Amino acid sequence: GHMIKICIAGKNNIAVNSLQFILKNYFEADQIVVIPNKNDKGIDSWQKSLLKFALDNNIKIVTLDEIYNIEQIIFFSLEFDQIIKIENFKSDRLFNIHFSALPKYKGVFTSITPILNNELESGVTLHRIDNGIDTGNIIDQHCFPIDINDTARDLYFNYLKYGESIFKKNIQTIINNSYKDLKQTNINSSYFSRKDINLVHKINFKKTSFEIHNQIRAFIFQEYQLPIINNSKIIKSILANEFIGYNVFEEFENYFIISGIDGFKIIAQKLNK
Amino acid sequence: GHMIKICIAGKNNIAVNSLQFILKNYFEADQIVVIPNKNDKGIDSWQKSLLKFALDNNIKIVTLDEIYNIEQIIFFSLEFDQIIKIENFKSDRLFNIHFSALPKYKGVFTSITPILNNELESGVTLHRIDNGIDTGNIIDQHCFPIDINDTARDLYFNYLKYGESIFKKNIQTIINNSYKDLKQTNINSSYFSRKDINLVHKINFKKTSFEIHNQIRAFIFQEYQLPIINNSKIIKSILANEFIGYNVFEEFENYFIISGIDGFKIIAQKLNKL
Numbered sequence A: 001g002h003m004i005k006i007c008i009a010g011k012n013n014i015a016v017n018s019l020q021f022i023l024k025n026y027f028e029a030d031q032i033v034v035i036p037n038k039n040d041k042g043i044d045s046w047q048k049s050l051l052k053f054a055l056d057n058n059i060k061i062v063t064l065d066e067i068y069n070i071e072q073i074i075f076f077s078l079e080f081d082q083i084i085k086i087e088n089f090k091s092d093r094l095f096n097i098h099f100s101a102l103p104k105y106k107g108v109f110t111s112i113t114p115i116l117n118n119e120l121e122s123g124v125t126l127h128r129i130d131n132g133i134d135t136g137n138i139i140d141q142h143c144f145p146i147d148i149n150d151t152a153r154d155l156y157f158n159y160l161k162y163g164e165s166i167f168k169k170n171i172q173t174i175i176n177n178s179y180k181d182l183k184q185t186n187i188n189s190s191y192f193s194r195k196d197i198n199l200v201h202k203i204n205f206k207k208t209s210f211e212i213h214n215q216i217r218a219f220i221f222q223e224y225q226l227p228i229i230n231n232s233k234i235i236k237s238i239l240a241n242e243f244i245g246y247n248v249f250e251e252f253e254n255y256f257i258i259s260g261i262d263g264f265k266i267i268a269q270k271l272n273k
Numbered sequence B: 001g002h003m004i005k006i007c008i009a010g011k012n013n014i015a016v017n018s019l020q021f022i023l024k025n026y027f028e029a030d031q032i033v034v035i036p037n038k039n040d041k042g043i044d045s046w047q048k049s050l051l052k053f054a055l056d057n058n059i060k061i062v063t064l065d066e067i068y069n070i071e072q073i074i075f076f077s078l079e080f081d082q083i084i085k086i087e088n089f090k091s092d093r094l095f096n097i098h099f100s101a102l103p104k105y106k107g108v109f110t111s112i113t114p115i116l117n118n119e120l121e122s123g124v125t126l127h128r129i130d131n132g133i134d135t136g137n138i139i140d141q142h143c144f145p146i147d148i149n150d151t152a153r154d155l156y157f158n159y160l161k162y163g164e165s166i167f168k169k170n171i172q173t174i175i176n177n178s179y180k181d182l183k184q185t186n187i188n189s190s191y192f193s194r195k196d197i198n199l200v201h202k203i204n205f206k207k208t209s210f211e212i213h214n215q216i217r218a219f220i221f222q223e224y225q226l227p228i229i230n231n232s233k234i235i236k237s238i239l240a241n242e243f244i245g246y247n248v249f250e251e252f253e254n255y256f257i258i259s260g261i262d263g264f265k266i267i268a269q270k271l272n273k274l
């Protein structure tokens, strides 16, 4: 087989830390190639750059076209931005870690969609890549709570952490082609595309307190946007069991007090800016 | 105490059958009043008419304003259409059976909302009425499956059946005032108003087969409406485990074959099929 054993394709700390773990434990630089996402700027920001780590560690940056004909290569997507077509590849060893508890929440924006749909838990799922979006057979899953006042940003940093851990847990069996998998069910399968989510959320206040709270915190991801109430950005929502009456809305300098149709207290904290 | 011991307010098979049960087992006609819903024409149709049953059985028809001052009355809403204010009422014996597994799916259209939100089960919940919509303390609940090919209509007939049953199961304790209840949680609570549901549903096909199928079947309730695909009304959707390829969409004389982003076979039957 080839000098090249593995391609890491993707971004952010899950890709960089999983590549570092490969380089330290399994494969040398000359055995690895990397495909960064289109938007990788080659510098560290609020996540580390895959492109930078690869270049710093003498790992070649390649395109998809450059790896299709490499026999037996392991292709591993860690937040990769391109939909692949399996028949382009000689190898069938194609894997992804998806940031949801599949079969739920296929597609994109998976730090927003579980919260917006009232879930109490999410997960990370290692699966085979097939020609659909997050549809391939499941190899391993780790489910974890969405705590009641977690935001989309908090959820995303949990995916990063648990995704890195499920990679480390399973990578030796992927290298040895000794893993087991199971086809996904039709029932419970759900999917959201970019068009399904308006990133400038307009809150429906004719909803339960849990729903209004979930609407707010699903959009709290400051690196991208914060939800806005009367022209103030909200940085945190806090839901309590305290009944304060139905349909409360009051604005204060630093926060809003809100309740929905069931009357439980929400404190929506304004960004201190 | 007053002559009148109980009011049955509301409509359909659950109101009529529960009233019939009360009359057979607990109370006489001259101890009962009814408030039908505003739309009750007194005609048995695909549901029985509470107005007709009361007239046929010599049970007085009343307004809310006529029972507010009645001491100790049991007020039972069985699909009643009016939001009451509890302070209007001398009595605190105010009960509803809600067609969902509370705390989820408060509000309206509850034969549509759980299917549209991808649930595998629903339920009926007996609770105290408080000033909010379906927010009062839960007395009893029975959960049951939404079978994979059930329509909104099929789910409504299960609410009527399990609702009548939970009424019969609990009425002794309401009559003796010995029942127990528990406040609803804030978490998992959800609510839909009339405005949240467009009854002329436009299907989003960039979804999984389970989601496309739920979109179709949640709107199948023929006395009201049927979903329309390519200018054809749909009477049934059937979701299979069979993979047929991603994003299939083919129109035939009597049905559509459809799959979503995960490729599982849906058969959407046209109303015109013989």
Ligand SMILES: Cc1cn([C@H]2C[C@H](O)[C@@H](COP(=O)(O)OP(=O)(O)O[C@H]3O[C@H](C)[C@H](O)[C@H](N)[C@H]3O)O2)c(=O)[nH]c1=O
Pocket (backbone or CB within 6 Å): A079, A080, A081, A082, A099, A107, A108, A109, A110, A111, A112, A152, A156, A199, A219, A221, A224, A225
């Ligand atoms: C772009 C963007 C993201 N976010 C949040 C929610 C997203 O879930 C989270 C991560 O955004 P993202 O674009 O990195 O990823 P997601 O949209 O979560 O995941 C998709 O895109 C990745 C690049 C992969 O292709 C993955 N297979 C896809 O599911 O950041 C915003 O809140 N506003 C935004 O404008």
Ligand SMILES: Cc1cn([C@H]2C[C@H](O)[C@@H](COP(=O)(O)OP(=O)(O)O[C@H]3O[C@H](C)[C@H](O)[C@H](N)[C@H]3O)O2)c(=O)[nH]c1=O
Pocket (backbone or CB within 6 Å): B079, B080, B081, B082, B099, B107, B108, B109, B110, B111, B112, B152, B156, B199, B219, B221, B224, B225
């Ligand atoms: C009116 C209407 C109803 N439906 C279906 C879905 C509904 O869940 C089901 C029953 O309709 P409905 O109007 O009788 O009842 P729902 O909307 O289910 O229940 C509300 O209205 C009742 C009269 C009570 O006030 C109850 N407390 C409310 O939750 O029929 C339609 O599909 N299209 C429609 O246009």
Ligand SMILES: Nc1nc(=O)c2c([nH]1)NC[C@@H](CNc1ccc(C(=O)N[C@@H](CCC(=O)O)C(=O)O)cc1)N2C=O
Pocket (backbone or CB within 6 Å): A077, A080, A081, A082, A083, A084, A085, A086, A096, A097, A098, A107, A108, A129, A130, A131, A132, A133, A134, A135, A136, A192, A193, A194, A195
């Ligand atoms: N075939 C394949 N299956 C996958 O499960 C998979 C890959 N490739 N490659 C890596 C990654 C890519 N994930 C994604 C997910 C969505 C979009 C995307 O652009 N979605 C568009 C809809 C595209 C369409 O309808 O064709 C959107 O607007 O949401 C891109 C990459 N991945 C698994 O993570």
Ligand SMILES: Nc1nc(=O)c2c([nH]1)NC[C@@H](CNc1ccc(C(=O)N[C@@H](CCC(=O)O)C(=O)O)cc1)N2C=O
Pocket (backbone or CB within 6 Å): B077, B080, B081, B082, B083, B084, B085, B086, B096, B097, B098, B107, B108, B129, B130, B131, B132, B133, B134, B135, B136, B192, B193, B194, B195
């Ligand atoms: N106080 C009270 N609580 C209840 O839970 C209850 C009652 N009354 N009365 C009987 C019945 C009434 N159920 C309902 C539910 C919704 C609407 C309704 O018209 N909803 C409007 C929004 C109402 C609003 O915003 O104030 C809508 O457009 O959906 C009417 C009656 N019921 C429980 O079953």
Ligand SMILES: [Cl-]
Pocket (backbone or CB within 6 Å): A011, A037, A038, A039, A081
């Ligand atoms: Cl990206």
Ligand SMILES: [Cl-]
Pocket (backbone or CB within 6 Å): A070, A071, A072, A073, A090, A091, A092
């Ligand atoms: Cl090969």
